[PDB]
Design a binder for this molecule. Structure first.
Ligand code: HEM
Length: 152
């Protein structure tokens, strides 16, 4: 897992996100959808968004960004002791939403990109290393639940 020092870096970085949860959430989803248009097709409520302008202007997209990052933040604050929080998310994403694990890799990469974009020069090598590890742990625990379900 992550060391105590690594968790402290993760949660320090997360303070930056919490100062503007909707803004970070919106940018993460826009990075995901523009980089990987197939992902948009999993959202019946966003498939009408035909341009980035329309995405940027969507209050509902910002709302979902808030829901996503709030869930992720609750998970990160558990510092790996996240079974109860993570199991239901993994199961809804496999069974209801049909989200392949590759798309979770995509959104993980989008989070790292958005952190650099919004905090250039303020997201250092140690911070990126710790946040990467945290997102890998998140993805890996979801993947174990996916394997249990035989999903993908
Ligand atoms: C950081 C990773 C993610 C987190 C924390 C997250 C969290 C959530 C939460 C809390 C919900 C609402 C509750 C639920 O249905 O379980 C949700 C819904 C949903 N998620 Fe995610 N999600 C993540 C990644 C993804 C990705 C990568 C996709 C697709 C590419 C996706 C697709 C969906 C869809 C289609 C819904 C239903 C939206 C609606 O119609 O209301 N999620 N997610």
């Amino acid at each position: 897992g992550l060391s105590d020092g690594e968790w402290q870096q993760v949660l320090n970085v997360w303070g930056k996100v919490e100062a503007d949860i909707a803004g970070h959430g919106q940018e993460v989803l826009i990075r995901l959808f523009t980089g990987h248009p197939e992902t948009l097709e999993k959202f019946d409520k966003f498939k009408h968004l035909k341009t980035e302008a329309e995405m940027k202007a969507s209050e509902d997209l910002k709302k979902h960004g808030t829901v996503v990052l709030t869930a992720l933040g609750g998970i990160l604050k558990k510092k790996g002791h996240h079974e109860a929080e993570l199991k239901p998310l993994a199961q809804s994403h496999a069974t209801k939403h049909k989200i392949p694990i590759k798309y979770l890799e995509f959104i993980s990469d989008a989070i790292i990109h958005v952190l650099h974009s919004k905090h250039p020069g303020d997201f250092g090598a140690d911070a990126q290393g710790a946040m990467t590890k945290a997102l890998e742990l998140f993805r890996n625990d979801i993947a174990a639940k996916y394997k249990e379900l035989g999903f993908q």
